[model samples]
Target chain A: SLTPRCIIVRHGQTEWSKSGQYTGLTDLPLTPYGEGQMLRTGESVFRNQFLNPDNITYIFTSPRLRARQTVDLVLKPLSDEQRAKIRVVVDDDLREWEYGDYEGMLTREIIELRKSRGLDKERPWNIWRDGCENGETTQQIGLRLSRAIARIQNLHRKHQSEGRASDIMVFAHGHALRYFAAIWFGLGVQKKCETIEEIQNVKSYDDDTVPYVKLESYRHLVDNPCFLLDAGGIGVLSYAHHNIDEPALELAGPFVSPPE
Target chain B: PSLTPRCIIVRHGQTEWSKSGQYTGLTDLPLTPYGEGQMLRTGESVFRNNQFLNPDNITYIFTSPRLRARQTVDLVLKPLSDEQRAKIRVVVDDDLREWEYGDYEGMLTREIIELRKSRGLDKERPWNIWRDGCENGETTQQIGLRLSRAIARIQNLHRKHQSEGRASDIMVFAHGHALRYFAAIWFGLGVQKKCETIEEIQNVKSYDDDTVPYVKLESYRHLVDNPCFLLDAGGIGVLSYAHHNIDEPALELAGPFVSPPE
Candidate 1:
């Protein structure tokens, strides 16, 4: 029943998050309320044994303050010995979507700023569609995430062949994390690739070019994008039929708490 | 996380049709004995102290009229105290009923495919219910309309309680296909433009005028084909909004167990 899973956790709420501001690359710590929110989240998630800390192998987290704080608090329920055994990677690729000049601005403010610059006359400013000026484009973010995913999947493939329970945890920001989940389903791999080597061979990360031709554009990903993670919420991504070729978002799963 | 309102969706325990992979739409079947025990276990696990589903905050309970769905609700509510049960408002809505399988009722997916192929239909491709719908039953659009109505009501209830600074948790009990479709509708994915109208679902004025725009997104369709969102008998899932905003509907894929105070 054990399968490899990539569990994505969005960091707790921040001042910018509560106020509806665009926060990207600006390292804001979680608010006092946000801290409490995550403690409850941490205790409930880990304490109930819904996610066994033992099953976790590698944890990939954003280098941001809020994300790191979340990782610390979410792991609070575990013992120091249990926590030390897991490898935690502070990955920059897991940072929030770079908002560039529009960073720390509200949606309305971003629209007003765009209008003042004689931009978005045809339509309003959509971060998913228009992205941000002087910041990361969807293509840029996708390539970096592909690199991160390639690394994670390689780890999973290694454990999966050995019939071990390998769960990879990803803690990051809202937009970037959502994009990560979207890209999970969007990434195209070989039809019959089973081994770690086969999976690695499929990921051709050139220095400049976007690797996969079938890669879904940000617009396509955002069009009716349904995956939503609240600040401090968690979502699961795994392969359907236990095949890495068929990645699927878990819409809902039954809670199985061990009975005495 | 506790303050934000969420809707809990529970798929009824298994029946003969479900166990055998047959379409059990509108078929009045009760939960098997094993199914009954499964729900009793689920009730003990979920409806307890500090659990993801806190019955005191459960303002509304919507369920399908089917016997199995009703049975699952009864078992899950068994853990509630008398006072907690009194605080909840339970309604059995017809719209929450299982998908009307029409001619394919009681037939397995493979059987339906074979039936369609022999009839010279779906020769080009497989018979996917999400796309082709059911023959002489309901179309995907119709199911979306009914489910949107149910979602609108649930959201309105959540919105009302949230505005008053009260915690609200809604529970919905239904069948497999119905619950998955409800989740898709709740998230505003794979739905037609007409299904996005809140005014049509209910007369209540929405909190935000900018409703979630519906596009013909194939992502959810792909998910359904992979059977990604499929729930097992007696399985439960949570649906809510991000940032406590009703406009931003989201699905809680995995919530933690909150044990009562040690």
Candidate 2:
């Protein structure tokens, strides 16, 4: 039996991104340019044959407005059969890192404040390392991301046992998605910064500290569509596969649906 | 003496951003837990003291279109009888909206002060809303004018009911900025100095009779016995004044006024 595989993509730019502010838990719609970027990215995924809409057995996204909007834009290329087979679900655990009091302020402004306070010049300020005054710490985010991944993997195992494809796609924010990838390979949380910064970072089942065998692992752009092969022997591939189930999964609970 | 119509005016409760003193315009955020309690208490106070305002006779009910105001109305309505509920009509009106803070919408007061300092304005001066532009924002005068128009509409509705002898009571659920102005206009006072006096005096008065409109400011003393959240009339008065000031240092220096002890 093969383990189910998962793919993740972060939503494009937002108003906060343009202002260089931390935007966690603040619901902001994408600007015009952001919508355009999403459209192009979705078309690119389709043109590059990343994953056939029909073969993507499961699709999950964060309940944030931006993430849901991203999912709707990205799924435009799927045929009616593929669209019907792909079930989109929203999971709160996939939410972005809550920036707390720093939510609407720019990084430059924060650094300037630190400088004025006579902080050491050599010390670096990382959003994921030091939590905002009213927000969650990096350790907290790491824990939540791991929990979400574990649940998804459990679902993957069940779906694979039922003879259905377990290739899943997730649309979420940048910080959480990066953390999720680190946890999938059993890497330390602090090491996530280095891994995410590298353009070509990759991980395979062979690198797993767990008892699982290595399948394949590689790093691509955060927005670029890619695939993973689970260690349990399930070949969860993305792009043009025809055998994937239609009408994906119906997510229950407090999850939001993909935009119409 | 003939029975006079009684009116109860309530300001909406606190929000996550409101607690932090953010200029919450059309942001549509929900009230914080503390705010919800305030609304509940408001309902209780009406039920207990203002017997005339009972759900059966609450002839007119209107709220600002924003989520916070609407939620406040719901919280207050929960204690009312079905008869009271049916008499109430929740109307979302743009005239009752908060003052448009423009580019200053989401930024903190401290940050806004810093920005103003960079532009060569004294960060400690009592910032008045002049007619001139302040970097993509409307002056206080512009806000007052817009608010005056909205109050006229409310009065028009009030007059229609009064003429028909259907109802003399009216309640407006709105934001701090517009509500303050509406209260001022209700007395036929000038927008500038007269409206400013409300914050200084922490008192409300009837337009016809020079008597105080509000017995106690922000006390919600009419609500419940809980002292934990008892709002000081003086504190609310100061808050109204502080909101328009662009800088925090100005607010601090102008203090020693009065505040309800936390």
Candidate 3:
């Protein structure tokens, strides 16, 4: 029986997050509030010893600054001796969901504008499905994450066989991590593996099932029927019933009470 | 939009049975020392934030009437001024107890599985407590009914507080499975299916704390309305209805409107 933990954290409050802007691909810095939020996140791991060097196997973050900064502050306390044993990978695959032409537009404006342009569908403005006009679609995101998932499973197997914990800490954008999580457990991987050799090489950036997989993954989309991770929120992913194939979701904490 | 009432739920601190992953249904154990320290720390670092869970805003406190939950509520709510605590009503209800395991009480999940297989009760699917109620224990319908009723009571208080222009924050202290069950139904999700299996549930968060777990449900309106968020143990989770329509429940972890005041 093997149990590995993946911790996914959205960067803390950004200026865009505060006002609800579409912050995809475009680089934005964390607001003062954002910095505080990430600091607390850093404090959380450091104070509680949530992800210790002894247990953590990998730290993967998006190439975006918010994601990078979030991971950096959270891990600033790690010793160089401790840092050496760990693998730190800056992955573009972990980037925020691209908002395309809709970049910097609030969702409400996007909806109204699309409705005027006759570009909307049923519940027309759902970014979870339509994504942004000209932006990368869900299908693309799924293929990318599917490969990331297989690659991740490879490392977990390595550490598990060695009798160590594979605690993966991911610092990335909200939508991208959300999609990655859905594909990891609910939608079976591109393929399963007994050995690391089973990992999907992710041969081409141009595959058809890529879009098919993306569309199918979002087919059952419904709101708050279950769960959503807020920005800077912590999400834990692991297998259910101790079977690695039974991917399950574990929330580290809940949303706080709104201010009176 | 109108701010509907949201419920904040906390699983009790660790107990001997809990730390070992036992089916602690109906057990009246207390929090371990380590458990006590964690909640106290969580209370200070997470709960005490004036913006997220100002004790001043908490109007009611509900517990499972079990010792561990009682102890957790006391510790997590310790920062309240006497005047503030005095104004808050504390109600201990039995329905909030961990799901009754009947014959399976105090058994580890694996042990329960082995027992079931030995008894021929189930074979194919692992014994999902959500799917398979214990022999002579609470069923999925019963768990849903109890937690649903509790949610209604809290929602009622939310309505009352709104009319009175008072803060509507309510805190629930209970066990793991029971709270998760409460969270599931609170959001209009079905009972028979595992939450992960539901398509509507995307990139969702589950419960894990003190070797236990907790989940929050909140409201959302994109691009303007504070987007929803989730937290498990230790952190606060708030939920109001979408567009103030109770029928459309919303979920979120702590939003960025406020942070822990230095």
Candidate 4:
């Protein structure tokens, strides 16, 4: 029996995404080419039964037009009856990370802007560490993400306890979707404001070479590694050992089905 | 540009111990009848067509020096012609073996926990193979280091073809933890950064948005249509570079599905 999974999908490409700009709260529609990417992705994964419609319960999407468009295109392959059963909720909490001062700016441009203003002298401007001038911080994003995570987890818990397979899908932007994944691992904010600083302080996956023999003692060494999800990409999160407490990311697994 | 080079990782088919939730490490157990059928089906589904994995482009086929992993490679590659099979180099590397589980070998998770508890071990904490590892067995660092060596070799082979702008798909067959850890090494996550893999490898735009052909709304609204034999295995995953750059290796969360041969 498979455990309940949260299927997190990033919306297909937009003009800003292709141009390498920081896309947050711009509400831009997907480029025609972006729509094709999702169409192909949906046809492949959904038709092949990788994203089994029977297992899916609810699909939560950002209120952004791109996210809504992505949801529509991704669901195109499912049968009419299959689509009718799964409810889609438009969630504001699922919106992209608000990039206030740096909105629509390229990374290189953002760095130049920050350097000129005597900001990021110690280091280059990192969105994870440095909050946008007038926008959300790590704490700000984490608070709302935790809310969404809790609701999704509760739904899973309810269905899982009753021995049912419940797959929850989330369609949103790149950075926001990535943050949702980071928060899914429960690296919750330790303090009111200092969220990403503490998260970055821990020994990252890149640094820890020596064996952590005393696993109990090193319980404080929570890894907050950034997971990658490309446009029209799907990442799955589920539990290990069928226990909800031991939540783990499904790096990749078998997709079993009867031969067509 | 040529198709992006891919390193396809396959987990060996289900064994009796695998189905029973036992820690299968170092023990040589053959696949059950059901497991054999599963691998054969997987081989037919994934390897028969050049859609997902192309036989001609496969550079190296690596398998664990274990019975099941070796068996997986044979069954997976059954669809290929004898000449096609001989073209690719097959190496049984020991580094591709499962994480050594010394005392905990052949023991279930619950059984291991209970045994540890009776011995006054892990009273406050639970046993996590990824973290604590097995008693008198390999540590996370040891397994991580072993897989890193294999990963480095695979990357070097991929780097050669990458320089030539050719399709170089590397295939691997191994156990559960070993294959997963191999992918972890591919991304520089859950392991030491022994290999100078990718840095800042995120949001790879493999498909150029501007150049892609846009499907009509009516066409998409009504449509439902859509590994290596290194031809047969139970679980398959692809690890490749973004923009075909060697320094930008990324795991394919989901690649486009190609229809199986009828």
Candidate 5:
């Protein structure tokens, strides 16, 4: 069965977001432009065939106000019945990465603070790996998101067996939404895909490397998908190869259907 | 006086190797009849009409030396009138050839991993091409180097054309690995890191009985500095800088590139 997909959306723009400031728990409303961006996405992606009201089983959003506002705009395209049928839940785990000392700070300020503390003297700061000092560690965010993914996957599994569309629409902050993608990457492969591996005809193959021959199913590691999402850009998450064991990110952008 | 540039890349149409999940490198092969049809269908969706790009705007056509890439470029642009084709130059650059897999050539990735495990290679850690490369095959560094040159060459082509305010964009017909490598290096990121690879790897949808076109857009540096790919055979994607910042790269799957900057 094709593992159902997740539409992981970053909340629309905010004043702090406009300045590129790291906004955590500071509750703020979307800028007029931010609301407009989400509305535009609704017109193009949300209301269209890309995201159907019939297929969405659940909607998860950060408890933050901006996220709540963003989700409201995104879901506006659905019919009243469709909206009533879908479940929208607010969860803190989907909130933006806690900025701690770096709260309300921009990139330059963070760099200066790091320099004063001699924290990153040799190399630059890796926000994902290093994380905000007082704020939640990358490990911490990763753990919470893992629990969230487990929840998503469990629900997906449940929906899959029920013959229902298993699409989960997640509305969250940039860091939080991005975190799910990072964890979900069941990494799938540079097996010299261009050049076939000429090897002994193992039991898995037809025992021939002669002309370009296909090989048996083999497990491999690929970092999979990660999207640097725009404030209103919609992204996708699902099992790579449709295997829930292999969650991956898919860009919710334009696509051309194959010839019928 | 720099004109906007776009990197138009196409992953060669599907062949037996790609369909059945085999590694197809250096071993010259052609696309399946089905693959050819798919490319033709893709051309109909793009590269024609008032689509994002017009064939007349294509300045240079860089293709992999392999037959599949050559054939893909030939077919995808077949719609271009003879007058247009006669004006375009098809350069078969070796740098764009698929990764060279020595012993692992034509072997399944899983089998290769299994074989490596037996060799006590991955007992220490998992071997990924972005990191460990292949046994007696091209290293990530080597592949990175080649693709860097290809990207530079193509970028320079666009730069030159853009300067004169003529059609600055060009097309690249390459293998899966070659294109991924180009994207990674284009962002000025080294292959040593897998994040870029991971990010761009899932450019296209997972395949089954149906088909999806893998497309990528390369525009003058801006938000699109980070690279994206349509790992699928014929999925359409666009590459451009985000929010008007050339350094802020934006990659969108399923969209038309900002058609040749008017």
Candidate 6:
């Protein structure tokens, strides 16, 4: 049987992104640095034989510009025949977190304004629970993300049974991609937070061989140098996927925090 | 001695650019579906929380003539008394508009950063107004001046009402930048180039002590359920300067920068 592998990659950073503001449905393009990061990511994927350009049948990207650009950059190295096999599909379901009213303002600015009003301390300003004053709640994002994953899984099953393709790559943003990981594993949306806490955790889980109905391989090309590997094997993977008892995998690294 | 009049400031809800972290200044976009819902909730919350200001006691309810601001006021009035609604007024003061972001008006921050990099300009510096004009946009200095003048006019109206014993409370609904400047003016903060010093969604009160008007409150607290609403002026102020060499004030005003009632 041809093994089914899903490769999920996050798009390069954008201007609003570097500023720590929320970028939801708004279609902002990538910064030069972001574009460079995508190129590097493409190179990394190309160097590693995660999937042959000819074998990657379905290429899904968020409707946003950043995701589309990342897909284009990744496909740049592929031959014409390989590119012909790959069809780019824009999926709204793969979009970023909808920040609602607090979308553009810095997170720090919002917190400062809230503290000034004497709000309850326990009421954390989490996008998941309390939706933005003008946007969707985390729960809503989770539901949409879950639906997208289910759609992808159904598509994967159809393709696999027909022997059409064995590998699928999806390009999206940080939060939505992490949320998709949780939903794909039938886990709760809040659990995805643990996955996003560390990029290495995303990489490690991508290496794992079980829990997935069909055998699939995952890889993460992160821009931040500090998040390259798991320190003492207790990186993001240990935190997110380690709890699940399945086929054991080799772990590596020096457990050191990134320099301030 | 009579109690000082209280004022409530409600910033208009979010717009399309606002949802994407873009610098939304003069180009007015309508409220998103969620923004309209937020406005409805704000009105309901105000009507329920602030029972002290009766319909008759509220002297004037003025809103900026911008469609977004006008729509916000309209949504709010739906929950208020007809007497209260009748007291409401709409004014088209150009000064009540947002900050003019020049060439960066509709574009997102990422796009602007790319543009700056292409021009070899340092994106790290606070945006320079002199060289950044896109079309018919005003500089930061121009906006400050207009905002200060418009605020002076509003204060004059407030004083006129006080003199006639017409009403004690005056409420004005407007955009972010103008409101910030109005707060600065209320605090006697010089308006020339320091308009960026004050934060947004602030409420300032001036009380008459022996019939002498004195600044009592600035950026007072209203009902804030979301911790995300806090404004860390210290951090934001640092970003305002071109260089990080400036020292932030060690002291923070008490109770969310509010003015006490007269």
Compare the candidates by lDDT and give the number of the best one. 1
Better of 1 and 2 by DockQ: 1
What would the per-residue lDDT of candidate 3 be over residues A1-260, giving only the tens digit for each residue? Answer: 34786777888788898888888888888888788777776665555354566777778778788888888777767788877777777767678778887788887888788888877565556655556678876555655666566556666666777877778787888778777665554532343333332333434333222221221222222222333566677766776555565555543332322211
Rank the models by TM-score, top first: 4, 1, 3, 5, 6, 2
lDDT of 5 by residue, B1-262 (tens): 3434556667888898898778888789889998889888777657663265677777777787788888888778877789989987777777678989877878888988888888878776677776667678887656665565556466555545655777555677887766655654554344332324433333322112111122232321211122222356654444443333334433442234221121
**Model-by-model DockQ, in order:** 0.23, 0.01, 0.19, 0.09, 0.12, 0.01
Question: Interface Cα RMSD for all candidates?
Answer: 4.4, 27.4, 8.6, 7.7, 6.2, 24.0
Give lDDT tens digits, candidate 2, residues B74-161. Answer: 8877877776687666565565677677767876767777777788887556333332323566555545544554444444554455
Better of 1 and 6 by lDDT: 1
lDDT of 6: 0.49
Q: What's the lDDT for candidate 3?
A: 0.63
CA lDDT, every model vs. true structure? 0.73, 0.50, 0.63, 0.69, 0.64, 0.49
Query: RMSD, each candidate, Å?
Result: 7.3, 23.0, 9.3, 12.5, 13.4, 22.5
Query: After superposition, which runs of candidate 6 have C-alpha atoms over 4 Å from their true positions?
Result: A116-120, A163-165, A189-260, B1-262
- Candidate 6 CAPRI grade: incorrect
**Which 10 successive residues of model 6 chain B have the least lDDT summed?**
B233-242
TM-score of candidate 5 relative to the true fold = 0.65
Q: Which numbered prediction scores highest in DockQ against the true structure?
A: 1
**Alpha-carbon deviation at A105 in model 2, angstroms:** 2.1
- TM-score of chain B as predicted in candidate 4: 0.80
On TM-score, the candidate that comes out on top is 4
Model 4: per-residue Cα lDDT over B1-262, one tens digit each: 7877788888888798988878888899998888777777777767653256778999788888889998888988888899999888888778678989999999988898998888889877677677777799987766665665567567777877878887898998898877776765575454233233342222223222332222211100000100001112376777777656777776665432332322
> Tens digit of lDDT per residue, candidate 1, span A189-236?
223333343234333332221223332222224332545566887877
Evaluate residue B216 in candidate 1 and report its C-alpha lDDT on the 0 to 100 scale: 28
Native contacts present in candidate 6, fraction: 0.00
**Cα-based lDDT at residue A254, candidate 6:** 10
CA lDDT of A17 in candidate 5?
Answer: 87
